[PDB]
Amino acid sequence: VPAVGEDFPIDYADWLPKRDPNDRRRAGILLHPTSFPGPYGIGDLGPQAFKFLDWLHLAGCSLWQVLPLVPPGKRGDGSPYSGQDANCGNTLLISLEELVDDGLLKMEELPEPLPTDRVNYSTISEIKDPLITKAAKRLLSSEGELKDQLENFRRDPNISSWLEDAAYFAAIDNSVNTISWYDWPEPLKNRHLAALEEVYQSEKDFIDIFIAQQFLFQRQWKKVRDYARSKGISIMGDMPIYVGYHSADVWANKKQFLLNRKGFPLIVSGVPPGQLWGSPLYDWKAMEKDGFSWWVRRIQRATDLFDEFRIDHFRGFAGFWAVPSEEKIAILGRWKVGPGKPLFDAILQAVGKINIIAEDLGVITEDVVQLRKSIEAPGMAVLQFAFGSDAENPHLPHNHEQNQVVYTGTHDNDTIRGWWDTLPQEEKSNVLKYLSNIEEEEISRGLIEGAVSSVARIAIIPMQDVLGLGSDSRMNIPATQFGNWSWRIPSSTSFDNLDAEAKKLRDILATYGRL
Amino acid sequence: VPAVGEDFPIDYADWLPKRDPNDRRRAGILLHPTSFPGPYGIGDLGPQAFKFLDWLHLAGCSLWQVLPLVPPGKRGDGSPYSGQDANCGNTLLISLEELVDDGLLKMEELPEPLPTDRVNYSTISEIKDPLITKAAKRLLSSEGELKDQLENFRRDPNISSWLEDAAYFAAIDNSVNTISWYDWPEPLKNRHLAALEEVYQSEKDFIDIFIAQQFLFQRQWKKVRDYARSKGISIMGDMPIYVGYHSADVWANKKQFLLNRKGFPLIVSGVPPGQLWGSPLYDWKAMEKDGFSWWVRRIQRATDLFDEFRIDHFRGFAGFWAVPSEEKIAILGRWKVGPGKPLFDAILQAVGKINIIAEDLGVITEDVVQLRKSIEAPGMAVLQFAFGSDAENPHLPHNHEQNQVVYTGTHDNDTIRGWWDTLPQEEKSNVLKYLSNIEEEEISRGLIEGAVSSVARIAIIPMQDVLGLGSDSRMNIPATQFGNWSWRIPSSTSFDNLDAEAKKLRDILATYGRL
Ligand SMILES: *[C@@H]1O[C@H](CO)[C@@H](O[C@H]2O[C@H](C)[C@@H](N[C@H]3C=C(CO)[C@@H](O)[C@H](O)[C@H]3O)[C@H](O)[C@H]2O)[C@H](O)[C@H]1O
Ligand SMILES: *[C@@H]1O[C@H](CO)[C@@H](O[C@H]2O[C@H](C)[C@@H](N[C@H]3C=C(CO)[C@@H](O)[C@H](O)[C@H]3O)[C@H](O)[C@H]2O)[C@H](O)[C@H]1O
Numbered sequence A, B: 001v002p003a004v005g006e007d008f009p010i011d012y013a014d015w016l017p018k019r020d021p022n023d024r025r026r027a028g029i030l031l032h033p034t035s036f037p038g039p040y041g042i043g044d045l046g047p048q049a050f051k052f053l054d055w056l057h058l059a060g061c062s063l064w065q066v067l068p069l070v071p072p073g074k075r076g077d078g079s080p081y082s083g084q085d086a087n088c089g090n091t092l093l094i095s096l097e098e099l100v101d102d103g104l105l106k107m108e109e110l111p112e113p114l115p116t117d118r119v120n121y122s123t124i125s126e127i128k129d130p131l132i133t134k135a136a137k138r139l140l141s142s143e144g145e146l147k148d149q150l151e152n153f154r155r156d157p158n159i160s161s162w163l164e165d166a167a168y169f170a171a172i173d174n175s176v177n178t179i180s181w182y183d184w185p186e187p188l189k190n191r192h193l194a195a196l197e198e199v200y201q202s203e204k205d206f207i208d209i210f211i212a213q214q215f216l217f218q219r220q221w222k223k224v225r226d227y228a229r230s231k232g233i234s235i236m237g238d239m240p241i242y243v244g245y246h247s248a249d250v251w252a253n254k255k256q257f258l259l260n261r262k263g264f265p266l267i268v269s270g271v272p273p274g275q276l277w278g279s280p281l282y283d284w285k286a287m288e289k290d291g292f293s294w295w296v297r298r299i300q301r302a303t304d305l306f307d308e309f310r311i312d313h314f315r316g317f318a319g320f321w322a323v324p325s326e327e328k329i330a331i332l333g334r335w336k337v338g339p340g341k342p343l344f345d346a347i348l349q350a351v352g353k354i355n356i357i358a359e360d361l362g363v364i365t366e367d368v369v370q371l372r373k374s375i376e377a378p379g380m381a382v383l384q385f386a387f388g389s390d391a392e393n394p395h396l397p398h399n400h401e402q403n404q405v406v407y408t409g410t411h412d413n414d415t416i417r418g419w420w421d422t423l424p425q426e427e428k429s430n431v432l433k434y435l436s437n438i439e440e441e442e443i444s445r446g447l448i449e450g451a452v453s454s455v456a457r458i459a460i461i462p463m464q465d466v467l468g469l470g471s472d473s474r475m476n477i478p479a480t481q482f483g484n485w486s487w488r489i490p491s492s493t494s495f496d497n498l499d500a501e502a503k504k505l506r507d508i509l510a511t512y513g514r515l
């Protein structure tokens, strides 16, 4: 500007305040693709994914939130948070119809329509796995555009940085079949170069098929993401802070983790009173020495899948609970100093600006708040947690801030109707008083409008709440072992029959500036 | 914290996030003391002030907002924004009952009860001025504690820095009686030291009485502020950015203003299309040279009266419209560069942390937003301005921020009921839709709850809205010449009969975390 007291330009008054596009108010739906309806026992990245994104666009939503897309471990269950690998895609999400379109499968090979209500994780692999393998084998023997794209995918330096290790790990797991790589024969456990060369010779078809399957996943997921972008929809993903011990992530990167000389975890994850989670812990001291290269690669893959993502247990970057691996419960651990902002500095330098959502629920310490504010990451508000304490409860709308994501509830919460059904009478009248004496019969509308009308720049509604569903549609009960991750949109409900639900959401998005 | 990877203390989990007392959510009432009821034609700093603060405390409010407390100029009208002086108190606010308590007036000298509905600014001075003068004369001839306190007040270096000039200015104005000091005899206009010595000799009684009156004001206002503090109530004041030409502020500080060699303004204030306000403009270049001493003294006096205060036309600190003083309308001016943050740096250095509210209504430029955010000053939201454009209207609750003050309406707005009565049908249905399909009959409750439930850390309700009053109770219609600043609480309404109104406000303060 000119000196104090001097004339501004004649056009000074045109200099109106700048709206930053990253402050745009948006609404989204939480819907894991396993939950899409269809005839093959599990939702997929096929026709229903495009039908869903058309419905979202009709509803005026500009965000779609999914759970982790990794292959769930089968040491039970279908949990997206117990993955076999941090970077691979769940091959059960591959659309059999899109592979028929590609010429990789024949109409005739498709199974007869399966029961539609719920995912049966005990049977779905045995049905789909042989068909995905058949398609992969046809791709590997093909000589067209898709073969060229497979070759470009497998030679991409970002892809090969995790996929080669993931494929060799899977080939060895299949062949040796121990509970953990801890018990592998020493040449495979300790990655003797000559032993790995022999694995490629004896397990070549397995490794090539595994890689082709990851290409088929990548190509279908990129078609979905491209379609979402064409409709102005961003995809928000999710990642656990910790990875599983029995994975290529640990076996191929042992010095990134706090293991003993035999590769057994010295300390494992959990929370004090408490909860023993049992993941191996990062050697954050050793990671700082190489510029957090392992974490940079994990974030690079996450940005390949998602526009933005949550990190579950974000508090672990500030401080983490470490339990001696011999211990069988959480009580006897210690809080350890997390890497803090220098991890996020390294990621910015290497990958540029990322939109990370900090999962910051429950008892968190001041250093977690300071770390989140230091990287300008939004935290969470969950309305189903707002009404059981006092008016300083940070989940109440009057305590929300602009740089925040508000939920009615996540995949870890009951549906609004299920939550209301088991809510104590004292807490119900509190809810109804807060939401301005609305009637018990309109509690869904009240909580959804409470989220959409928040100052929080992102509001997310689970699809179960749009469809008016009860506790029978809850995705997860934390710590329970059965009935989880299996909810599907019923076969009788089609996106083409939900125009009224889309209009009802669009009208409140318009009123509260999210459209 | 310890090094990355090392143990935290055993007590890490006790380190809960820090609530800063300056982020405390509060509610207040806007009520200028002229509006207090009583039998002497105008509200005062007497019994009704203490009755009001008891009511506020019963209502759970922790803030009281008043307009400027300066003596209104009589070149018409009662406007607190057209003051005779920036630093003096309005002697019409002096309680005649408290002076009877002090022994400075006799019961018998009190007038017979006057008409109670409205302030008559054309008659109130002629009634009260002679009585305040009588009390001042008794103080001046007295020999007790109050005489000692008067001597300590008039010798206080902060007080004397404005009061001596204010008293001499008033003595000369009374004696010479021109429309402006521009036309004073040269020795008084240009403050010849020998002419000022002669003024003290010939106008000694006037000057001593003027000073005693300012002491009587100070002492009554400090009793009110002390009582407010005892009840956990802060007082928020208000100040126009500009002062009036015909004042001690300009006459005793001519080089702080852009005047010609004869003391006539070179340029005057206003806004482009437009509005010619006609105040003299600050020489912000000359002010920076002495560390903004004049502004520091004005802020020091404001903190003597108020816990926190609004600055009206805060945008003038970034950029100001300057109209050539010969011009008779606003169109032919230029925007000039305001002093910016260095003024606020000087105030911090000299007076310490102040809580300033930025009046930032209407078309403001990006530099005004940057300046306000650079000193962490809250701006305003006014709900009566929210509903006539689109969902990006910054006055809508979903666009509010924590560091903000929300109003239903200010003294410049109609009452909620008056505003609703002249609101176009299209804007009414918009309002009712936004506030969640509430009924037209409950619009007052709806707008008050919309303010109290905001994320804005301060919510302010005019007393006219608590009392359910219509357009006949509006304090000001901007640019109009009559009927303004004269509303009083009717004689039939007493604070002791408002327990239901206090409880209704207290209950929503409890629900929305302002108690
Ligand atoms: C945030 O991340 C949570 C876990 O870190 C996730 O919790 C869900 O998924 C967990 C994997 C699950 N634990 C199961 C898996 C095991 C095998 O490694 C067992 O140790 C546990 O006893 C199993 O229950 C949690 O139960 C489950 O809530 C959240 O969903 C996610 O939001
Ligand atoms: C913010 O500040 C406003 C003015 O700066 C104030 O406006 C009210 O008070 C003004 C003094 C008034 N103008 C009158 C006074 C004059 C004598 O100097 C005339 O020039 C004008 O023509 C008069 O009308 C405004 O009309 C009035 O709105 C706001 O109230 C305050 O919030």
Ligand SMILES: [Ca+2]
Pocket (backbone or CB within 6 Å): A173, A177, A178
């Ligand atoms: Ca096995």
Ligand SMILES: [Ca+2]
Pocket (backbone or CB within 6 Å): B173, B177, B178
């Ligand atoms: Ca006069």
Ligand SMILES: [Mg+2]
Pocket (backbone or CB within 6 Å): A186, A187, A190, A192
């Ligand atoms: Mg070896």
Ligand SMILES: [Mg+2]
Pocket (backbone or CB within 6 Å): B186, B187, B190, B192
């Ligand atoms: Mg002279």
